[PDB]
Amino acid sequence: EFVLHLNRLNPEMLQIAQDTGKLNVAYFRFDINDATGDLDANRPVPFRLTPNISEFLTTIGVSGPLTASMIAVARCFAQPNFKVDGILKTVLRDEIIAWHKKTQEQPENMDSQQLVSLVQKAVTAIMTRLHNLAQFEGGESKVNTLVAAANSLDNLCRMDPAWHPWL
């Protein structure tokens, strides 16, 4: 949700499988700004770490496995050999074409320069967040600050009430 600038995780979107504990989201979409075609996802919280979830996870569960898992995923996707940036480019190309069809518009293709620039800007924003989270110099990670911002009541109280910042 944070690194890929996806739309906010409403509690109706979060599907919990009682038989296994596996979670899936129905459904994430890229948070493309319809007016400008770039990603925002600049919400008051970086992800849903709301008080009922925080209580169920417990402070040990938030500090240890949640944070360590986020750090590990960030460090894994930042490995150059995986070439995640290329996959992101080829997916966001379809996303940008769809945004152009929805907003700006053998139908003529959109401008190659505009498409390339928008896709590069979006992938750069994604990879910037990814590389910020992956950085682990000194034994400290931005992920701890990100988790603290998500749990913080100051950030929670500024969210949409329909998001349920109490649940």
For residues 59-98, which are near another protein according to CB under 8 A?
Answer: 59-65, 67-69, 71-73, 75-77, 79-80, 82-84, 86-91, 93-95, 97-98
Tell me which of 100, 115, 121, 132 binds another protein, using CB under 8 A.
115
**What distances in angstroms separate CA 73 from CA 65, 86, 135, 146, 166, one per listed residue?**
12, 18, 12, 14, 27
**What distances in angstroms separate CA 74 from CA 23, 84, 126, one per listed residue?**
19, 11, 11
What would the two tokens of residue 159 be?
């969210």
Question: How many Cβ atoms sit within 10 Å of the Cβ of residue 152?
Answer: 14
Question: How many Cβ atoms sit within 10 Å of the Cβ of residue 74?
Answer: 23
Query: Interface with another protein includes 24 (CB under 8 A)?
Result: yes
Q: Shortest Cβ distance from residue 30 to another protein (Å)?
A: 7
Q: Shortest Cβ distance from residue 92 to another protein (Å)?
A: 9
Q: Shortest Cβ distance from residue 63 to another protein (Å)?
A: 3
Query: Interface with another protein includes 149 (CB under 8 A)?
Result: no
Tell me which of 33, 128, 157, 167 binds another protein, using CB under 8 A.
167
Question: How many Cβ atoms sit within 10 Å of the Cβ of residue 49?
Answer: 21
- Taking the C-alpha atoms of 39, 40, 46 and 52 in order, what is their torsion angle to the nearest 10 degrees? -100
From 39-47, 106-114, 149-157, span contacting another protein (CB under 8 A): 106-114
Among residues 12 and 154, whose Cβ is nearest to another protein?
Answer: 12
Site size with another protein, rule: CB under 8 A: 71
